[PDB]
Design a protein around this ligand. Structure first.
Ligand SMILES: O=C(O)c1cc(N2C(=O)C=CC2=O)ccc1-c1c2ccc(=O)cc-2oc2cc(O)ccc12
Length: 256
């Protein structure tokens, strides 16, 4: 209803699933509606990379050229002369949403079909990887390639970061990278009080798709895991990061 009102204000469709891991209390709004997952899939991709490698194996250096570079290469364009390690590539993918870094990591785990297989193996029957960066964002309404839902993304994000799809050292690396995300200050982070730690990964795609997935730690107690997904209407629609910030405030009010 506050969520209804936000849809009205931003002329958008919202998808919200949040779970308090301390109480199992939930806040749901279209929790099972599909949205292009966009770059949020970088978080699940690193999850799988970490599963498929020792911490030491992440030190393997990957070489590439301007030919492995795509539309958006913030860190990856600085190091084509020397290459980057897998650890450095996981850092750039998660924290700067480097599309090139994501594509090389995808290559290392075996491309979209193998990502899907590993996602099915951990219990995710909804998230549907099909394509590399950036083609995956171009989703028309009614298609299901490169989509997930807010319920699925929280369940999968929780499985890697918080439960037993990874051992503790690797969960620590995942959560460290995601706590130090640079792309998310005006989204979920802006809807949470200061002093509350947030680990997040953002996405943006056509149809004004604007997403954020996060783990949120209140000083007091167990983490909350949250997906805020949104889309419009128009293919060339703009989004407004404020809608995510405000949705996040409503979620925290409903659980506090
Ligand atoms: O670069 C792009 O193609 C683009 C690529 C991805 N991307 C992923 O999210 C996972 C791999 C990948 O290609 C995600 C979002 C965008 C992106 C947009 C994509 C299509 C278009 O409809 C508008 C986009 O607008 C964006 C805006 C941002 O601020 C930041 C980003 C975007």
């Amino acid at each position: 209803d506050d969520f209804a009102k936000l849809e009205e204000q931003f002329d958008a469709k919202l998808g919200i699933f949040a779970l308090d891991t301390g109480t199992n209390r939930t806040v749901a709004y279209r929790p099972d509606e599909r949205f292009a997952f966009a770059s949020t899939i970088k978080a699940l991709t690193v999850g799988v990379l970490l599963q498929q490698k020792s911490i030491e194996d992440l030190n393997q250096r990957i070489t590439y050229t301007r030919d492995d570079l795509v539309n958006y290469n913030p860190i990856t364009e600085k190091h084509v002369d020397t290459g980057m390690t897998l650890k450095e590539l996981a850092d750039a993918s998660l924290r700067y949403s480097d599309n090139a870094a994501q594509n090389l990591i995808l290559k290392q785990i075996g491309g979209p079909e193998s990502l899907k297989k590993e996602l099915r193996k951990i219990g995710d029957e909804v998230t549907n990887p099909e394509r590399f960066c950036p083609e995956l964002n171009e989703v028309n309404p009614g298609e299901t390639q490169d989509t997930s839902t807010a319920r699925a993304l929280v369940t999968s994000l929780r499985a890697f970061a918080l439960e037993d799809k990874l051992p503790s050292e690797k969960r620590e690396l995942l959560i460290d990278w995601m706590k130090r995300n640079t792309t998310g200050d005006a989204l979920i982070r802006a809807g949470v009080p200061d002093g509350w730690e947030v680990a997040d990964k953002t996405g943006a795609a056509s149809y004004g798709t604007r997403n954020d997935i996060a783990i949120i730690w209140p000083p007091k107690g167990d983490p909350v895991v949250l997906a805020v997904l949104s889309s419009r209407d128009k293919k060339d629609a703009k989004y407004d990061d404020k809608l995510i910030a405000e949705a996040t405030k409503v979620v925290m009010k409903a659980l506090n």
